[PDB]
Design a protein around this nucleic acid. Sequence first.
RNA 1: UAUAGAGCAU
Length: 802
Amino acid sequence: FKPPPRPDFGTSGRTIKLQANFFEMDIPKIDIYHYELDIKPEKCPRRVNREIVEHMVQHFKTQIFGDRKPVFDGRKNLYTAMPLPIGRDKVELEVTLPIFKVSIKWVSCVSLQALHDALSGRLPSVPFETIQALDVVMRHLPSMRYTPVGRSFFTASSNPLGGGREVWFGFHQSVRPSLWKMMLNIDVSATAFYKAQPVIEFVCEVLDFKSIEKPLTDSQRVKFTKEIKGLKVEITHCKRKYRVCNVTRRPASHQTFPLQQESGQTVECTVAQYFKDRHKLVLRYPHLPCLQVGQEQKHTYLPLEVCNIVAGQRCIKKLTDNQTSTMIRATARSAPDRQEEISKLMRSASFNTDPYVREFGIMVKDEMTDVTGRVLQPPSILYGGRNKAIATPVQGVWDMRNKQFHTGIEIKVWAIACFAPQRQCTEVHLKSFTEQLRKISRDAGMPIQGQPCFCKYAQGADSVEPMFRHLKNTYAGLQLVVVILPGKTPVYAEVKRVGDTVLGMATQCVQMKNVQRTTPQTLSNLCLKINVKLGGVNNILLPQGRPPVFQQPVIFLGANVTHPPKKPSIAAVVGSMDAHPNRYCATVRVQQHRQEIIQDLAAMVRELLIQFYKSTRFKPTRIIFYRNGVSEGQFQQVLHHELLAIREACIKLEKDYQPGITFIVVQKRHHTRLFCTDKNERVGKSGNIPAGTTVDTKITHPTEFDFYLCSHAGIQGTSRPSHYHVLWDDNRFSSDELQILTYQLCHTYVRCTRSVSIPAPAYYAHLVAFRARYHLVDKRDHQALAKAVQVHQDTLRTMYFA
RNA sequence: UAUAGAGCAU
């Protein structure tokens, strides 16, 4: 269960000069002394812990600390570059700030030399405790100077998004090990916050009011409840922060709570009356509801006009479609621009003048690390038809002009369901849309032979299922049902649910805007999905020139767990069903809320292996498992439970079936940025690195098998190079063969003629989980939730998720 | 239609 070492360094590809947002750290050889803080009371905010620790350092600078500048991680860990005048014995002391008891005890020394030795690769594993200590040193001053959020820092600059939310600009910071060097990783980040403002103004923005002008309808009140629930408020009629648990149904003039009088008897008092008697405040908006704060037992109700949303709360609830576009537009930066913003950050951070960094004798190089990348050459894409045409990706893109599908599918009986009113979508429109899909159809090797046999408009999600039940029975061999949607509507969720999991009909929805104004590229892309949904093969990797792994039966898997913002989490595993590889079967499960480990993985892998054996007649000798987005924190847990589950599936099939397992974690959510050193290598308006750029040196793991591969062309903003970490490899891949293999798999994604940012199986796993969300639509029996996700027997064999 | 892109613990 220990990750394998790096087997070698790749040599394939054209060398390219690069810079990464990794800055070398010169670490002294000293020992760090580690002290544990016990602060009473506990579970104060990390900030107050810092202020408590802050004042303590000056008082006992005379007695305890002196001229040393200790660093504090909040919570309970304090570090010094110099041992404190404290015997191993504990010291209990008192800190008062506008009363806290604090006990200091030595815990350990951190040997920076041991880190030096582990970076040489000599030690088997880098000491995690030394890396933690360095991280606390580097972010001590930023933590005091800004509002920390995860490993990022933010501050006050308006960048509105509407609905009460703002986008804040900050930066990410983390210390990371590489070969022979510790690195500081710095990046610009931007996240959504709630604007600090009176709650009265919050309801306006959440409910679109011009101004506060009576009562809330059930509609308005339940919407405002979702927006504010969980957010923290501060009191103004007295500075006192509460958490909003709920928004009362009754208005402040009629909401009551039990109040104990001078005598022992308790009475019901309205919130409005109480604020008249106890605070001499006549509520200005008595018709608006209250906020229920604190424990349910106390009946703590706060009128809206007395609370502010507390400044600094990071928005985690999902953003509306418009807010998302405004944040994306406002945060996208071209690769060259991002490099400059990082350079500015390093200048203003001025780490080499941070007194805490200098206290510990640390220096940070101000230039980005130079790394040589290798641009891998892309695969050739083999198409079908009489030409047998071979596309060659250029800058991560190709097209399908003068080429047709490898295995095109005759569409002899299909038809159109229009859910947009015919004033919007007219009969002339449908045929004006159908006539051009025909041309792009037959051109592309998938010929829609004739007209749409049935063409009936309608509205209503209840209309969805009956219409479909009508069509499957009456039209023999009805292959495809095209559906037309008028903007966002729950009909979409019902169309997939019915077709995917009920009747088992190939479904293809098209926005109403795209039928009226037709693009050949949009039509062509529309055929990519249609053909696959009907069982076709759009194209295959050029058989020759595939990596040697294809000499023996191999199955490729992609695993993914998507979580809700308690709603259940969704696990998805897809598996290749041929040697191309192009066709994938899907398995999906619902599991506990927010659990990263795929609980039912063993049964899912077993199902996929059986399907592979039925489709090919071969038992895979090798299992290549692409696992999406598990942080390093959970490598050991995820690997332990999921690597054993994979083996369990093979042994459960056949006592002595033991194919080689390669376990690879795939990570887009990191802060590694790569920039071309030479301007001639920039691709596009965004100026990113070329598709195929691979880095496995200089900024990678000191001993383990990991590499960055930017398989895609950067279109908007700065590219995210995908990171791949081999946690297990029975098959002893060379660095070259695994990188090339991973790159070629990024060219087998059927939705577009472009190399995508992750391999098709990992991308399909994301789609299969994503589609299961719409399957779960309602209008919570866990046996019934597993039922709403299980797909029809007709569809499951085919890639319905495309 | 789709890739990419900011983020996604009283």
